[PDB]
């Protein structure tokens, strides 16, 4: 169960943190004592961002500006980030390529983009940030969607990259526990959620109810703190079970009994 | 209810057909009197697979070398063997990049190839392949894996590769039923195989046991001659009722009705 001082004094990356969900993670973070560096490509709406964390009782608050569409920026941020901070305890991926809601024509080098913006520097930057989170026995925080589990017609290259991210990193978490890794993997599942992009994108085109930014920030917050392997905020006590695949949880350990771990 | 005439004089691709599922893949389509094309990096063990489809009743067999990791050859791989069958039918969808079993612990260059070879070419393959499928009603068959569908460990950047390809592919797919778009994309769910190459890489590793090639080539034709959307071959009867989600079948539905179709 949650309190708010599991956060204070804890050294933070927020990515795509210079508006929406990311924006919020940010906020709340800083109202908890954390220190935080926060990322995303425009610098003004970025500084505009550690001000108010400052404002708000943030420990630290910098930020730095790149496309993460850069792996050695990628790279290159997690070493800054660490070094401002004397280290790292949690890493919030939670950046993404804007996309429209489209039918799919044969546009490739959109597959390719979003693939790299929120799948391979995801990786990176978990790749990079490792060491620190080893020595501090941290966490990650894998920010993904509803259409990282299920399937929407009109998104195609986006819930590719985000269903990827679960593979990816739900392998990790397994490998982490059978190694005695002690650094937590928190894949974050979320309805709609009601940012200006969000908002933006669907009026007219997707009808359901949105859950509210500023809750979606902090629940991804929590369940990251707590350790939980998934978090689902997707406006429902009842439909995380329906995402959450009861079948996928059997098999998995079922099958881990069919390797010779001794080997 | 199935039978082989259906593929008589269809003209037909097949990936990965240097050996392994692929070749057994070409071998049957040959019985059945297919057209068809090969590709492998390998032209040697090519001229060998074609050689026998062309002794066995192939209305016709040619290869193509050339590797899967060139976006620009898979793109003109396409049409080279559009020329040559004089039209398109089917494209099997089955070479992959096999990585070293191992824990994961840093090799990000895997993660790029992986997806680079077993995902990225299944899409630009697919949008090159696309006018010819829709002039025929023709058929896709994305070849994919329990580990695209559940994680295990010791394989990470493969599982992420295969997993977006269920992303991907059944959003393109869900796509052509409201588009009314007749052509069929069917996902093959396949676990241990025994082709030397997964029995080589899993000897001592994972215990359990493997169904054959040979059958698991058929069941990959039938499935997709017979459009359907899934096909399981994973060793028994009741394990594709746990992958196989009826959690997400319900949202995926569900939520056909939340959207503006008039828009
Ligand atoms: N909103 C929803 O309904 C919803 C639902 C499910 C999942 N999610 C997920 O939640 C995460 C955030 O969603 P959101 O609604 O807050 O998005 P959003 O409000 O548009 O904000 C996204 C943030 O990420 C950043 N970003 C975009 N391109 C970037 C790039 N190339 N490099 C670095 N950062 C980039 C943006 O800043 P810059 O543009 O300045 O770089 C912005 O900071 C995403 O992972 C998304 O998939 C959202
Ligand atoms: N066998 C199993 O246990 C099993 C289980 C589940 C899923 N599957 C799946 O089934 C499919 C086939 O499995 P497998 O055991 O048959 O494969 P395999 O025996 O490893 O066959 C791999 C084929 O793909 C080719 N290939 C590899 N890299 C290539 C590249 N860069 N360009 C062009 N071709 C490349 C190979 O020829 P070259 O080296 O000559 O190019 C070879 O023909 C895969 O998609 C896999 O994920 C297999
Ligand atoms: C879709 C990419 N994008 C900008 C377009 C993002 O801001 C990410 C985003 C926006 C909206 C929803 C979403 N994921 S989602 O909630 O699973 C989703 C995706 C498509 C449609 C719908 Cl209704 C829903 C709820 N992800």
Redesign the pocket.
Known sequence: KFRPEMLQGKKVIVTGASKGIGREIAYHLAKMGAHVVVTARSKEALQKVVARCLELGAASAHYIAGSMEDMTFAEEFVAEAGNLMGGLDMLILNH?L????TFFHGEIDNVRKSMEVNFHSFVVLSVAAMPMLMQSQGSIAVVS????KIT?P??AP?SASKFALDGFFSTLRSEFLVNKVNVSITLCI????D?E??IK??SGI?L?PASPKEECALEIIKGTALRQDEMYY?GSRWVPYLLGNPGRKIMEFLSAAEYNWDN
């Open positions: 993404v804007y996309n429209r809601l969607s509803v259409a990282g929407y009109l998104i986006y979320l309805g709609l959620i940012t992009t969000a994108a669907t997707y359901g997707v």
